[PDB]
Amino acid sequence: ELHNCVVVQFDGPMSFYVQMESDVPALEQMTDKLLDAEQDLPAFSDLKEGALCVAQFPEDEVFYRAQIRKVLDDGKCEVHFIDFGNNAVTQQFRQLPEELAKPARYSRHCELDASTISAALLQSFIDTRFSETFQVEILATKGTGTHVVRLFYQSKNISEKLQ
C-alpha cells in the first residue's frame, strides 16, 4: 500500500520527514487554531532541550508547534517544527496550550532500508520536487517512531536512483 505524501525535509535517505495526505486536514486545523490564538499566547521562557512550545518560523514570521533542540546564545534556540520536519533558529517562543499539545506530530520522520541502499544526486532530485506528491510504503515503525519505508515518485521507487 502506498500513501500520498509531501517530502518536506530531507537530510538523506536515512533521515527525512514527510506529511501524509491524510494528516493534512488536522494540520490545517492546527494552523487555524494557532493563528487564531497566536497573539494572546503568553511568552514561553523555559528554554531547555526537549521542551514543547510554539516557535516562530523565520520565513513565515508564523508560530508553529515546536520542540527545542539546543540552547544557543542570547535567547536563540535551535527548534524543530514537529508538524513539518524542518529546523530553525529563532528567539520568539510562546506557550503551547495543552489541548493543542495532545495531538500527535503531523510530520513523520523516515528512512529507507540501508540494507538496500549503497548522495547529492537524490538530494537535489527530491528538493526539486518539494511541491510534488510522493508515496511511501511504511515497512515498519522503528522503536523511536522513525518509519522505515520505500520512497516512490509517480511509481518509480526512487531507489532506482541509488548506486
Binding site: 518536506v8 490545517e28 508564523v62
Partner: peptide, 7 residues
C-alpha cells in the same frame, strides 16, 4: 514548503 503553512 509543506502544508498548513498558513500565509
Amino acid at each position: 514548503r509543506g502544508r498548513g503553512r498558513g500565509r
